[PDB]
Amino acid sequence: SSVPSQKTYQGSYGFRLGFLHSGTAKSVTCTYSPALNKMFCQLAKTCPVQLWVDSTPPPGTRVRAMAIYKQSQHMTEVVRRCPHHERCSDSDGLAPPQHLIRVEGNLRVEYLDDRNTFRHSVVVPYEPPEVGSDCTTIHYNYMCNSSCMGGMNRRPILTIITLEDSSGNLLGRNSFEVHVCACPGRDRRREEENLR
Ligand SMILES: [Zn+2]
């Protein structure tokens, strides 16, 4: 009832998500399944997420990411890191050690513990598409495995990407499921046959 919305809205700017066409080889650290709308990635590795827009949001626009549990009986529970990982210092001195989602390669990164919902989120300033690219790419890191006991503990999660203005007004929203694991390529292949 107080759970964050995961409803898709492209909004004024035609906000869409995009992902690299990376394939499923062993060496891949991040691979996306268009069939599943699901990202398979490695712990603490680079996870490119693309922002596609029909119109450019003004400077000052922010991009927020938040994880929630997929299943209804776990949706009220705040997605956080497991004790083991929250106890180690893989902490970059910006991210709170409890946050599952980080952004790498951005010194303007901002982290939030919601005063009321206790939910974690990470936000970065929106920048217009790179040279030689028609989208804007953000590098996320997931700091726990899906399997991590005492954390997600094999419970499936979604990442909600929100576009908001400098004043916090919602502009658009999208989402994708993510599975954090040692063999992203292997698992994508497996889950894509599981449809059949
Ligand atoms: Zn963990």
Residue numbers in the entry: 95 to 290
From the paper:
R273, a DNA-contact amino acid, is one of the most frequently altered residues in human cancer (6.4% of all somatic mutations), with mutations to histidine (46.6%) and to cysteine (39.1%) being most common.
The crystal structures provide high-resolution information on various R273-related mutants including the oncogenic single mutants: R273H and R273C, the rescued double mutants: R273H/T284R, R273C/T284R, R273H/S240R and R273C/S240R, and their complexes with DNA. A superposition of the mutant structures onto one of the wt core domain structures shows that their 3D structures are similar to that of the wt protein, demonstrating that mutations located at the protein surface have a negligible effect on the structure of the protein. The mutation sites of these proteins are compared with the corresponding region of the wt p53-DNA complex by modeling the central A/T doublet as shown in Supplementary Figure S4, confirming again the inability of His or Cys residues at position 273 to interact with the DNA target. Reactivation of these proteins is achieved by new interactions formed by the second-site mutations, T284R or S240R, with the DNA backbone.
